[PDB]
Amino acid sequence: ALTKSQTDRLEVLLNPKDEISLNSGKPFRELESELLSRRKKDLQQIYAEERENYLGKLEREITRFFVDRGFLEIKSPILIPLEYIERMGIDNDTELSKQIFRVDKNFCLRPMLAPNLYNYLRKLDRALPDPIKIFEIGPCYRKESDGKEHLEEFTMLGFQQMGSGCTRENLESIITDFLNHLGIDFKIVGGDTLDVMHGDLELSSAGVGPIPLDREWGIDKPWIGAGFGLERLLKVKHDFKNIKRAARSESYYNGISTNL
Amino acid sequence: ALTKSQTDRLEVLLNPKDEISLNSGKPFRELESELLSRRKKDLQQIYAEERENYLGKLEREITRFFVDRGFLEIKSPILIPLEYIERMGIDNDTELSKQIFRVDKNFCLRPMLAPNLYNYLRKLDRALPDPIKIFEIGPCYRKESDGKEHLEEFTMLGFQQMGSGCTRENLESIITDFLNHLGIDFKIVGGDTLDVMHGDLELSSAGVGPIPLDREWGIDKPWIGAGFGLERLLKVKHDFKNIKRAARSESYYNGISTNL
Numbered sequence: 003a004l005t006k007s008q009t010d011r012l013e014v015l016l017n018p019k020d021e022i023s024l025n026s027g028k029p030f031r032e033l034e035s036e037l038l039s040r041r042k043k044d045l046q047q048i049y050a051e052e053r054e055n056y057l058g059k060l061e062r063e064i065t066r067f068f069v070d071r072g073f074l075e076i077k078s079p080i081l082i083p084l085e086y087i088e089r090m091g092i093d094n095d096t097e098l099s100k101q102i103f104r105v106d107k108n109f110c111l112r113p114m115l116a117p118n119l120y121n122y123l124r125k126l127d128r129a130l131p132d133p134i135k136i137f138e139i140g141p142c143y144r145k146e147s148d149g150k151e152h153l154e155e156f157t158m159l160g161f162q163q164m165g166s167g168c169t170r171e172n173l174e175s176i177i178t179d180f181l182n183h184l185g186i187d188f189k190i191v192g193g194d195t196l197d198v199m200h201g202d203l204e205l206s207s208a209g210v211g212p213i214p215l216d217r218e219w220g221i222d223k224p225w226i227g228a229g230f231g232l233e234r235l236l237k238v239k240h241d242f243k244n245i246k247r248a249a250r251s252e253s254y255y256n257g258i259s260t261n262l
Numbered sequence: 263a264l265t266k267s268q269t270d271r272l273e274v275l276l277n278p279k280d281e282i283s284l285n286s287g288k289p290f291r292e293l294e295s296e297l298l299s300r301r302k303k304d305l306q307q308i309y310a311e312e313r314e315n316y317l318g319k320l321e322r323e324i325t326r327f328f329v330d331r332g333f334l335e336i337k338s339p340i341l342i343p344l345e346y347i348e349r350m351g352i353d354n355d356t357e358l359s360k361q362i363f364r365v366d367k368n369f370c371l372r373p374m375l376a377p378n379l380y381n382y383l384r385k386l387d388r389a390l391p392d393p394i395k396i397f398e399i400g401p402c403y404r405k406e407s408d409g410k411e412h413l414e415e416f417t418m419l420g421f422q423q424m425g426s427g428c429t430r431e432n433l434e435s436i437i438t439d440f441l442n443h444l445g446i447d448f449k450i451v452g453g454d455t456l457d458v459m460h461g462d463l464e465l466s467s468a469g470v471g472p473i474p475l476d477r478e479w480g481i482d483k484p485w486i487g488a489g490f491g492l493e494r495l496l497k498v499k500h501d502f503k504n505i506k507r508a509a510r511s512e513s514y515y516n517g518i519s520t521n522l
C-alpha cells in the first residue's frame with residue numbers, strides 16, 4: 003500500500019493524459035521510475051521540437067487575436083502608484099484592499115489592469131478615432147489563500163473598447179469569438195456586469211460602462227471590457243488539477259514537473 | 263525667445279526623425295500645435311496599420327530568434343525569495359544590494375535573471391541532452407538614480423548554455439548574430455567576462471563559466487551566457503534621447519508622447 007506522501011510524489015509526476023493507476027499493486031519505486039521516464043521524454047520532445055513556453059505562447063496567440071480585431075497593444079507599468087487602488091474605489095470594506103502587495107511608501111504591485119487601461123483610454127481619446135480599442139497582457143499580483151484556482155503571481159488579459167459599439171451584445175460577441183478561437187468551453191452568466199464561467203471556475207469578469215467610477219478617471223463615454231486570467235485558461239485547456247502547473251514557476255515547465 | 267519650460271514641452275513632443283528647430287523664430291503656441299498634429303497622426307497610423315507595442319514586439323522577435331537557435335523559452339517568477347540575492351554573492355559591499363525592491367519579509371522583485379536560470383539549468387540537466395540552452399525575457403527591477411540610461415522597471419533578456427560548446431568564441435558568435443539580426447551596432451570589450459557596448463552605453467554583460475559561484479547553485483559544468491536590456495536596445499534602434507521613451511509607461515506609446 004502506498005503512503006499518502008508517496009502518492010503526493012507520484013501525483014506531481016502524473017500528467018492528465020497518463021493512463022496509470024496509483025491504486026494498483028505496483029511498488030512505489032517502480033511507479034516512480036515509470037513516471038520519471040515519461041516526464042523526461044516529454045521534456046526532451048519539447049526541447050527537440052517546439053521549445054515554446056505555454057504562458058509566453060498563449061500571450062502571443064492572444065496578442066495576435068486582439069491586434070487582428072483592431073485593439074492596440076499596451077504594455078504599461080506593473081509597479082503602480084498605491085493611489086490608483088484607492089481611486090478604483092477599493093477601500094477596507096472591499097476584499098481586494100488586503101490583497102495588495104505594497105512595495106514602498108507609495109507604490110504597489112498592480113492587482114488589476116483597470117487603472118492603467120483607464121489612463122490609456124483617456125489619453126488616446128485625444129488622438130485616435132472613435133471607437134478606441136486597447137488591450138494589455140501582463141503580470142498582476144494578489145495575496146490569496148492557498149487554492150487550486152488562485153496564484154499570487156498571475157497573468158491578466160484586459161481589453162476595453164470606448165465610444166461607439168459599446169453594447170452588451172458586442173461584448174458577448176468578442177468573448178465568444180475569443181474563447182471559441184482558443185477552444186475553451188464557457189458559459190456567460192449575468193453598471194451592467196457579467197461573468198464568464200467554466201463550471202464553477204471564473205475565467206473572466208466583464209463590464210459595460212458608463213459607471214460612476216469613470217468620472218474619477220476622466221472618462222465620460224460608454225465602454226465595454228473584460229479581464230481574463232491566462233493561467234486559468236491554461237488550467238482548463240490542459241485539464242491541470244492545480245493552477246500551479248500553469249504558473250510562472252521553477253517547479254513546472256509546460257505543466258511537467260521539473261523535479262526529476 | 264522660448265523659455266526652458268516651453269522647450270521642455272516641445273522636446274516631449276519631438277520625435278528623433280522630426281526636421282524641426284526649436285531655435286527658430288516661431289512662437290511656442292504654433293510650434294506646439296505643429297508637433298501635436300504630427301504626434302496625433304503618428305498614433306493614428308499605428309492604430310490603423312500595425313497596433314503592436316515596441317516592447318512586446320521586440321520580446322516576440324527575440325523569442326523567435328532564440329527558439330530557432332535551439333534555446334528553451336523560460337517564464338519564471340518575477341517575485342523571488344530574497345535568499346536568492348545573497349546566494350548570488352550580493353552583500354552590502356556590492357552595489358546591487360541597495361538596489362533591491364523588497365516586498366515582504368522574505369521576497370523581492372528580481373533585479374536579475376541569473377538565479378532562476380541557474381535553477382532551471384540544474385533541474386533540466388536531469389532530463390535534457392547536452393548541451394542545455396535556455397533563455398528568458400521579462401521584467402526586472404532595480405532602484406537607480408535618475409539617468410537617461412536607467413529605468414527602475416525594465417525588461418531583461420538572459421540566455422545561458424551549459425555543457426559542451428561553451429567557448430568564448432561561441433558566446434561571441436551568438437551575441438554577434440543576435441545584434442546583426444536586430445540591426446544594432448555594437449563592440450564587444452573584454453571567470454571570463456565581457457561587455458557589449460554601443461558607444462558608452464552598455465547593452466549587455468556576458469560571462470563564461472565555470473566560476474566558483476556555480477557550486478552554490480548545484481552547477482558543475484561549463485557555461486556561457488549574457489543578459490541584455492530590451493529598453494536599451496529600443497533606445498539605440500530608435501535613437502531615443504532618454505530611455506523613458508522605451509519603457510513600460512503611461513507617458514509614451516512606441517516612443518510617442520501620450521500627453522497630447
Ligand SMILES: Nc1ncnc2c1ncn2[C@@H]1O[C@H](COP(=O)(O)OP(=O)(O)NP(=O)(O)O)[C@@H](O)[C@H]1O
Binds near residue numbers: 144154205232234
Ligand atoms: N489570484 C488569481 N490567480 C489567477 N487568476 C486570477 C487571480 N485573480 C484573478 N484572476 C483572473 O483575473 C480575472 C479578473 O479578475 P477579477 O474579476 O478581479 O477576479 P476575481 O473576482 O477576484 N475572481 P475570484 O478571486 O476567483 O473570485 C478573473 O476572472 C480570473 O480569471
Ligand SMILES: Nc1ncnc2c1ncn2[C@@H]1O[C@H](COP(=O)(O)OP(=O)(O)NP(=O)(O)O)[C@@H](O)[C@H]1O
Binds near residue numbers: 411412
Ligand atoms: N536599470 C536598468 N535599466 C535598463 N536596463 C538595465 C538596467 N540595469 C541593467 N540593465 C540592462 O541589463 C543588462 C545586464 O545587467 P547588468 O550587467 O547587471 O547591468 P549593469 O552592470 O548594472 N549595467 P549599468 O548599471 O548600466 O552599469 C545591462 O547590460 C543592461 O542592458
Ligand SMILES: N[C@@H](Cc1csc2ccccc12)C(=O)O
Binds near residue numbers: 159228229
Ligand atoms: N477588473 C479586472 C479585470 C479587467 C481588466 S479591464 C476590465 C474591464 C471590465 C471588467 C474587468 C476588467 C482588472 O482591473 O484587471
Ligand SMILES: N[C@@H](Cc1csc2ccccc12)C(=O)O
Binds near residue numbers: 375419421422468489
Ligand atoms: N547578470 C544579469 C545578466 C545575465 C542574465 S543570465 C547571464 C549570464 C551571464 C552574464 C549575465 C547574465 C542577470 O543575472 O540578469
Ligand SMILES: [Mg+2]
Ligand atoms: Mg479574487
Ligand SMILES: [Mg+2]
Binds near residue numbers: 204206207
Ligand atoms: Mg471577477
Ligand SMILES: [Mg+2]
Ligand atoms: Mg547597474
Ligand SMILES: [Mg+2]
Binds near residue numbers: 464466467
Ligand atoms: Mg553589466
